[PDB]
Design a protein around this ligand. Structure first.
Ligand SMILES: *[C@@H]1O[C@H](CO)[C@@H](O[C@@H]2O[C@H](CO)[C@@H](O)[C@H](O)[C@H]2NC(C)=O)[C@H](O)[C@H]1NC(C)=O
Lengths: 211, 218, 225, 211
């Protein structure tokens, strides 16, 4: 029943920076504090328990401190493999987890590799058309996708999905999917995708003509 | 050696009950405690309860209590979590966790965790996904893809060349369509030189509908 | 890491004590403390308990509404205010470290890892009495011709706790402090003997340090041939 | 609020013994065992899910099955002859500590030891205080059964005789004390006084006289 106050909620720091996270409790938890690493789409891994005890296998850069109410977790040198959601756990009386900390790597601007995919002939048979745009490996997360069917800007017809930060090159990948019927798709020729990003000087367009 | 296996993701109607298993292997189940943790969509980790598989005693969280019932079968070396009267708010990924005593320090710590089991609280029927290839019209890098369209429930698992091709793979999170069905795309960037000289098959797998697709993109 | 209790002694029926346990070597707060008594010849009996710093309190049915447990986390001390004492309360009172608090998890796997020396408490209408120490002159009959046995007679005292050492703790080899007799008078009588060399009998000095805690008497009697 | 165990259990040297404890709290909690020698504070031997503190030999092991928990002593040795107390935590209501009646463990009834008797006459200092006390000190014997008889020269004395009950020593053997209180008129009257220590037939008769 002891409350958790984990600060910050999110952070961005360059590879090598000294990342610092704090977890303050409502009452004294007598050093019974633990820290967990939850990498994107994975099971949480125990790094440090009992305030400062490091688990065998966990790298030396990870360390914990604090006593009573105030506790602090530190990564001495942030690595591109440290991309995760970090949580604090109290285990004095009952069990409570913290709000979490979104740890992302701050890096230099990377231009998106744009690719336009037409609806397959098998999909058209079913009477539906899905045009997919790809923004492979880019930084920062901010990216604008402007769909254009024959110089006509498309709003609402599109639906985009971005990936987590990459484990190796620490970049993102976005995929905007434009949907139309086999009838509305056959009424137009040129299907464009206008990508606006910090890595690109002018808004890059990757299109295709039907046929 | 020390592993914490969990049962496959499940879909249940709102108001019904779900029982999730946790296969303990590589360690004696009786020698530890087993916890259950609810992880809401994008939200924080929520501890549910603890069981002592050796004796059977249970300590549940005051909010989860009355709806959560943790069981353990030592002979089969598995721990179960039963959650009834399933609301839309119960739609989450549930984790089982091993808690071992550390003799040297003289403290207990929740060391190992299960892979997780996604619970989908929905009225919509279980549907297999339609797989479509993503190859363009006509530089160095060339992008290929697989469109895992119209399926329920989540999740789907997309491999490439039976798990050989791992680098350059980008399987985006599923987008919930207005149709009420999920859809996700899996792209892979490979050079043009290697293209036309290697087979590029994507291995789609939807366990709830027992769908298994191996489509080659050209 | 140590636990040392003090305060025990003689009390007349209906009276009160005065029991204090001093903790050292560890963080007193973050540990649940409890008292366990033991009547002579009888087994261990739990008295009271006090959680980490919560501060939850528990008493045994027999001592309910008479004994009061308290802890000074600043002074690293545990206390017990045992009021309206019955004759049956006569026991050796141990101060034990529970290691896990009743409010904490894993309390099912808890135990008393560190225990105290025990402070003897005697509930009797009879009055306290100090010891009469007499020197038991060296006797060459055992264990050798080059060894002789000399001792101290701790005659007529009350209650039972009497501490005997030799040459202010220096002499330990051959020291045998016999258990005391409960005489017809009701008073205890104890003896302590040490086998020392017959060669060094004239050169070395042998003084026994008798200490009767409940009468505050401290006798340092020298034994001579 | 009840924990029952056998009041006494007997072993043999090298043999394996199992001390049983039966309680309702043992279903929900784990038993902690304590070793207690005469005039000694209790010592933790086994606790929790068969946990032994450093310094406790491999001989001690903990078993559990429902309401019953068992302490197993593999290869019984002389130094293991002590009182064994089972203990639990309950956790229901106002009684969180439950102790057992104890088990008086006895090992092999061998080897027999001969008593070493030492007799002291009353000190001149004691005689000045108009009192006399003869000190008979029986030590290093086995079994703990001794008969003490006093004799004024040849005639036996039954009055003014106070003798202890034999008790275990630091070497697990036995020790007894017997005091004969007299008036200096009685001590000076004789003619010598004797202390008769009978142990398993064999009698040790140390004698003192005013000289
Ligand atoms: C533990 O048990 C033994 C055996 O019952 C006790 O020894 C007996 O003591 C009485 C006197 O009190 C004698 O008459 C018996 O002959 C003894 N029997 C044996 C086999 O030695 C022993 O006293 C018990 N220990 C305690 C502390 O109660």
């Amino acid at each position: 029943d002891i409350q958790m106050t984990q600060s910050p909620s999110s952070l961005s720091a360059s590879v090598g920076d000294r990342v610092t996270i704090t977890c303050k409790t409502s009452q004294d938890i007598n050093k019974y504090m633990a820290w967990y690493q939850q990498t994107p789409g994975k099971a949480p891994r125990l790094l440090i328990h009992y305030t400062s005890a490091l688990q065998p296998g966990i790298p030396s850069r990870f360390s914990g401190s604090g006593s009573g109410r105030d506790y602090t977790f530190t990564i001495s040198s942030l690595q591109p493999e440290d991309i995760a959601t970090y949580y604090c756990l109290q285990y004095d009386n009952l069990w409570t987890f913290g709000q979490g900390t979104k740890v992302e790597i701050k890096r230099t601007v990377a231009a998106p590799s744009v690719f336009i995919f037409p609806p397959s002939d098998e999909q058209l048979k079913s009477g539906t058309a899905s045009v997919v745009c790809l923004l492979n490996n880019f930084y920062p997360r901010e990216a604008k996708v402007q769909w254009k069917v024959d110089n006509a800007l498309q709003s609402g017809n599109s639906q985009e999905s971005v990936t987590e930060q990459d484990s190796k090159d620490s970049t993102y990948s976005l995929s905007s999917t434009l949907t139309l019927s086999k009838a509305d798709y056959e009424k137009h020729k040129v299907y464009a995708c206008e990508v606006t990003h910090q890595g690109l000087s002018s808004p890059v367009t990757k299109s295709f003509n039907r046929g | 050696q020390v592993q914490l296996v969990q049962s496959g993701a499940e879909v249940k109607k709102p108001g019904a009950s779900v029982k999730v298993s946790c296969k303990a292997s590589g360690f004696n189940i009786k020698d530890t405690y087993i916890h259950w943790v609810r992880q809401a969509p994008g939200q924080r980790l929520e501890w549910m309860g603890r069981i002592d598989p050796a004796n059977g005693y249970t300590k549940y969280d005051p909010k989860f209590q009355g709806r959560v019932t943790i069981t353990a079968d030592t002979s089969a070396s598995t721990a179960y979590m039963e959650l009834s009267s399933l609301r839309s708010e119960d739609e989450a990924v549930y984790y089982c966790a091993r808690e071992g005593y550390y003799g040297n320090y003289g403290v207990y710590a929740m060391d190992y965790w299960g892979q997780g089991t996604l619970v989908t609280v929905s009225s919509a029927s279980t549907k297999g996904p339609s797989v479509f290839p993503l190859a363009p019209c006509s530089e160095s890098t060339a992008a290929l893809g697989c469109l895992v369209k119209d399926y329920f429930p989540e999740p789907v698992t997309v491999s490439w060349n039976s798990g050989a091709l791992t680098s350059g793979v980008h399987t985006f999170p599923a987008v919930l369509q207005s149709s009420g069905l999920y859809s996700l795309s899996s792209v892979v960037t490979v050079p043009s030189s290697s293209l036309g000289t290697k087979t590029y098959t994507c291995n789609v797998d939807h366990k709830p509908s027992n769908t298994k697709v191996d489509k080659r993109v050209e | 890491v140590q636990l040392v209790e003090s305060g025990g002694g003689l009390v007349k029926p209906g009276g009160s004590l005065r029991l204090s346990c001093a903790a050292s070597g560890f963080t007193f707060s973050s540990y649940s403390m409890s008292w366990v008594r033991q009547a002579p010849g009888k087994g261990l009996e739990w008295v009271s308990s006090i959680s980490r710093s919560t501060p939850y309190i528990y008493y045994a049915d027999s001592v309910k509404g008479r004994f009061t447990i308290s802890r000074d986390n600043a002074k690293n001390s545990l206390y017990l205010q045992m009021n309206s004492l019955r004759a049956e309360d006569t026991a050796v009172y141990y101060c034990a470290r529970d290691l896990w608090s009743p409010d904490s998890n894993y309390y099912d796997q808890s135990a008393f890892d560190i225990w105290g020396q025990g402070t003897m408490v005697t509930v009797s209408s009879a009055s306290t009495k100090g010891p009469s120490v007499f020197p038991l002159a060296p006797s060459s009959k055992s264990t050798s011709g080059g060894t002789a046995a000399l001792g101290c007679l701790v005659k007529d005292y009350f209650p039972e706790p009497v501490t005997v050492s030799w040459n202010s703790g220096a002499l330990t080899s051959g020291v045998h402090t016999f258990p005391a007799v409960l005489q017809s008078s009701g008073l205890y009588s104890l003896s302590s003997v040490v086998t020392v060399p017959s060669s060094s009998l004239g050169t070395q000095t042998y003084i026994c340090n008798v200490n009767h805690k409940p009468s505050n008497t401290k006798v340092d009697k020298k034994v001579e041939p | 609020s009840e924990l029952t165990q056998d009041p006494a259990v007997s072993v043999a040297l090298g043999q394996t013994v199992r001390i049983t404890c039966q309680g309702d709290s043992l279903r929900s909690n784990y038993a902690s065992w304590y070793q207690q020698k005469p005039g000694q504070a209790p010592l933790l031997v086994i606790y929790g899910k068969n946990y032994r503190p450093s310094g406790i030999p491999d001989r001690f092991s903990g078993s559990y099955s429902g309401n019953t928990a068992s302490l197993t002593i593999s290869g019984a040795q002389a130094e293991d002859e002590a009182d064994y107390y089972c203990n639990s935590r309950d956790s229901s209501g106002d009684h969180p500590v439950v102790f057992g009646g104890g088990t008086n463990l006895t090992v092999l009834g061998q080897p027999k030891a001969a008593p070493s008797v030492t007799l002291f006459p009353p000190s001149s200092e004691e005689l000045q205080a108009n009192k006399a006390t003869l000190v008979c000190l029986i030590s290093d014997f086995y079994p703990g059964a001794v008969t003490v008889a006093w004799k004024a020269d040849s005639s036996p004395v039954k009055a003014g005789v106070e003798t202890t009950t034999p008790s275990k020593q630091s070497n697990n053997k036995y020790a007894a004390s017997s005091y004969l209180s007299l008036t200096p008129e009685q001590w000076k009257s004789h003619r010598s006084y004797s202390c008769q220590v009978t142990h398993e037939g064999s009698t040790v008769e140390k004698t003192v006289a005013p000289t």
